[PDB]
Design an enzyme around this catalytic site. Sequence first.
Site, PDB file in Angstrom:
ATOM      1  CG  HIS A  16      -0.465   0.384   2.448  1.00 34.16           C
ATOM      2  ND1 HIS A  16      -0.256  -0.794   3.531  1.00 34.16           N
ATOM      3  CD2 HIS A  16       0.031   1.293   3.165  1.00 34.16           C
ATOM      4  CE1 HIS A  16       0.290  -0.277   4.637  1.00 34.16           C
ATOM      5  NE2 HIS A  16       0.453   0.867   4.376  1.00 34.16           N
ATOM      6  CB  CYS A  25       2.880   0.572   7.054  1.00 35.89           C
ATOM      7  SG  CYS A  25       1.358   0.604   7.787  1.00 35.89           S
ATOM      8  N   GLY A  68       2.623   6.165   9.109  1.00 35.71           N
ATOM      9  CA  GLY A  68       3.856   5.981   8.707  1.00 35.71           C
ATOM     10  C   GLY A  68       4.797   4.883   9.320  1.00 35.71           C
TER      11      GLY A  68
HETATM   12  C1  LIG Z   1       0.813   2.265   8.012  1.00 34.12           C
HETATM   13  N1  LIG Z   1       1.862   3.226   7.553  1.00 34.12           N
HETATM   14  C2  LIG Z   1      -0.601   2.732   8.688  1.00 34.12           C
HETATM   15  C3  LIG Z   1      -0.662   2.174   9.927  1.00 34.12           C
HETATM   16  C4  LIG Z   1      -1.963   2.558  11.122  1.00 34.12           C
HETATM   17  C5  LIG Z   1      -2.196   3.955  10.737  1.00 34.12           C
HETATM   18  C6  LIG Z   1      -2.625   4.017  12.143  1.00 34.12           C
HETATM   19  N2  LIG Z   1      -2.341   3.035  13.000  1.00 34.12           N
HETATM   20  C7  LIG Z   1      -1.783   2.002  12.117  1.00 34.12           C
HETATM   21  O1  LIG Z   1      -1.356   0.946  12.556  1.00 34.12           O
HETATM   22  N3  LIG Z   1      -1.580   1.568   7.826  1.00 34.12           N
HETATM   23  C8  LIG Z   1      -2.662   2.109   7.255  1.00 34.12           C
HETATM   24  O2  LIG Z   1      -2.947   3.485   7.452  1.00 34.12           O
HETATM   25  C9  LIG Z   1      -3.575   1.522   6.480  1.00 34.12           C
HETATM   26  C10 LIG Z   1      -3.511   1.593   5.153  1.00 34.12           C
HETATM   27  C11 LIG Z   1      -4.515   0.689   4.308  1.00 34.12           C
HETATM   28  C12 LIG Z   1      -4.471   0.640   2.761  1.00 34.12           C
HETATM   29  C13 LIG Z   1      -4.344  -0.804   4.640  1.00 34.12           C
HETATM   30  N4  LIG Z   1      -4.760   1.651   6.967  1.00 34.12           N
HETATM   31  C14 LIG Z   1      -5.413   1.574   8.278  1.00 34.12           C
HETATM   32  O3  LIG Z   1      -4.693   1.114   9.084  1.00 34.12           O
HETATM   33  C15 LIG Z   1      -6.856   1.415   8.535  1.00 34.12           C
HETATM   34  C16 LIG Z   1      -7.176   2.340   9.834  1.00 34.12           C
HETATM   35  C17 LIG Z   1      -8.599   2.493  10.026  1.00 34.12           C
HETATM   36  C18 LIG Z   1      -9.423   1.551   9.313  1.00 34.12           C
HETATM   37  C19 LIG Z   1     -10.987   1.923   9.621  1.00 34.12           C
HETATM   38  C20 LIG Z   1     -11.866   1.596   8.560  1.00 34.12           C
HETATM   39  C21 LIG Z   1     -13.321   1.846   8.965  1.00 34.12           C
HETATM   40  C22 LIG Z   1     -13.872   2.019  10.148  1.00 34.12           C
HETATM   41  C23 LIG Z   1     -12.700   2.183  11.154  1.00 34.12           C
HETATM   42  C24 LIG Z   1     -13.570   2.196  12.397  1.00 34.12           C
HETATM   43  N5  LIG Z   1     -14.774   2.295  12.071  1.00 34.12           N
HETATM   44  N6  LIG Z   1     -15.025   2.134  10.812  1.00 34.12           N
HETATM   45  C25 LIG Z   1     -16.181   2.163  10.255  1.00 34.12           C
HETATM   46  C26 LIG Z   1     -11.336   2.176  10.895  1.00 34.12           C
HETATM   47  C27 LIG Z   1      -9.043   0.805   8.235  1.00 34.12           C
HETATM   48  C28 LIG Z   1      -7.812   0.927   7.721  1.00 34.12           C
END
Ligand SMILES: *C(=N)[C@H](C[C@@H]1CCNC1=O)NC(=O)[C@H](CC(C)C)NC(=O)c1ccc(-c2ccc3c(cnn3C)c2)cc1
EC number: 3.4.19.12
Lengths: 305, 305
Positions: free
Chosen positions: B41, B145, B143
Amino acid sequence: SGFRKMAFPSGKVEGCMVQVTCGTTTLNGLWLDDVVYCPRHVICTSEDMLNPNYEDLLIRKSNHNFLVQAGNVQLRVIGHSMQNCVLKLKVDTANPKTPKYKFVRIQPGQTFSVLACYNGSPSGVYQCAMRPNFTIKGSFLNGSCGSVGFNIDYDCVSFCYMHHMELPTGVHAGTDLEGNFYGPFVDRQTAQAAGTDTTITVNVLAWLYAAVINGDRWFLNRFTTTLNDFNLVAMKYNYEPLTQDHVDILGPLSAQTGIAVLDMCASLKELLQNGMNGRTILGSALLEDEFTPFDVVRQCSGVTF
Amino acid sequence: SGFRKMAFPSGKVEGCMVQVTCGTTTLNGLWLDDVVYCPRHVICTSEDMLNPNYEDLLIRKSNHNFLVQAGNVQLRVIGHSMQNCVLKLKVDTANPKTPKYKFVRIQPGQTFSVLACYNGSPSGVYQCAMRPNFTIKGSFLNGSCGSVGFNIDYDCVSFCYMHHMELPTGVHAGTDLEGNFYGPFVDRQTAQAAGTDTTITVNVLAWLYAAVINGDRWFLNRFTTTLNDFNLVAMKYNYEPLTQDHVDILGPLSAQTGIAVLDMCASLKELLQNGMNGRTILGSALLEDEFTPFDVVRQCSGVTF
Ligand SMILES: *C(=N)[C@H](C[C@@H]1CCNC1=O)NC(=O)[C@H](CC(C)C)NC(=O)c1ccc(-c2ccc3c(cnn3C)c2)cc1
Ligand SMILES: *C(=N)[C@H](C[C@@H]1CCNC1=O)NC(=O)[C@H](CC(C)C)NC(=O)c1ccc(-c2ccc3c(cnn3C)c2)cc1
């Protein structure tokens, strides 16, 4: 999100650890530039340990009696001296892995990382606080003395602790890198008291701010208090008194959460006299006091080194 | 004496961390030999994140679109490919600090150390368990990941985890280094359930043996039980069922303490249905399940690396 007890990365300190042997006693030394630092009780036999005369013991020692090993390489010892409770061994080679460093004597309530070592090799790393009674709650076995505690500021290692001993209560005591003990302890095999183990109040409040930031808000109540009112209650539970300096140290976390410091104090006050009613905060069923306000800010901000 | 949650020394892994940037998105990569591994990603924009088509996104990318920095040095990317949920970037230079390593897919209940990084720089290290529902309770911000989890066996680093995401419950999910998620998770911005978070029963029992070894014996009772009787009670409290393999894994700690495994089970059974009555065990007011039997043996034995 999430909140964990986190140690500093240990790579810069790993490259400073060596093994120091006198006779049958082996412990760890810290090799920085051309000096190796280690606890002076490396020179004791098991029979000298009840009441050792370190001056008389050291006088029978020559440079060649100290065996210093970095890996499978012996360091040549060209001088030795006692500074308070640590031995300084002058060696003929400067450690090529010496990081930028300084020696610091930390304050009660401040935290640091311990690299636990045996035979000069690292076993693991964990985070400790210097308690108000100048002990630490570590994990140390026979042979662990000379393991060090440190903080990292960007690229500079601040060494603050070297391990020497265990107390009857199972907590731990040691010195700064100038060899002066934290607290009233001496390096002999006698039962020694640390006195009342009081709670680091400013750190509990920092941890409660961490909890709010990470979604645990159930303990926030509808009251506020005063500094004098709060301290009258907290000292009954063996909490350290909160000062106005402490209130200002908490200011940025207060600003970040919108919870006034004295409002958080009133929530802590109710937690102390009513308990947590079977609930948890950041995965704990006790109030945690080994995170500083700077620890909380760093972790919730992603500061790197 | 004493017992702490302890991470592995992180030096060997620190020397493998780099920064990987596509467009405005920067995360961490792991540089081993001439390959950099990172979460796929990194190629998403914030708008692709609800339901990204990673094949279509990657097809618009060329080698020169990936910026890989080790310190202030750019690595030249000479090839790229997707393997499940991780990107592999072929670079023209082998990491001179590559340790002996292997990739491992760990089992639920097993523990590992996480080196949390931002912009390719280490921020800290902490110990995690792979939960039965294939999440971890970490500390990760934007950041983070590409931060990795690992174990060390003497001189060999076993990489087992790379961080990708947070769930609505505040726990964390990621992949092995072949890019296959632990658990049923996918790398998109949707609410995803991990299911019931059950307790690692064999680990609680190991931690209770650690407690006995370190002087906390108040919870030992006068009863024993059977494996079937114990499991009927523990599963009511969402504990994993204890198997005979688990009983044998606990054998050396049982032998070291002289407490039969099923006697310890009966003490755990009473703790589950009566609570701890305001008392603590190894400084905790909850039952801790993130120490393996091998973790306990290593720490109470001073194994080094
Ligand atoms: C990597 N750098 C980050 C690490 C995350 C940021 C915050 N804490 C972490 O561990 N990875 C990401 O940002 C991911 C990127 C996607 C493409 C995999 N996404 C997520 O970590 C993420 C965060 C929150 C949600 C989410 C969706 C829908 C939700 C909720 C709560 N209620 N609903 C309806 C959370 C999804 C994915
Ligand atoms: C360093 N390698 C060790 C680290 C100790 C070993 C066990 N855990 C540790 O942290 N340092 C030592 O062995 C010390 C050497 C002396 C010369 C400083 N000694 C001690 O740590 C030590 C242990 C126990 C006692 C003790 C004395 C009397 C007691 C009790 C309990 N009841 N009584 C009457 C304990 C003294 C010193």
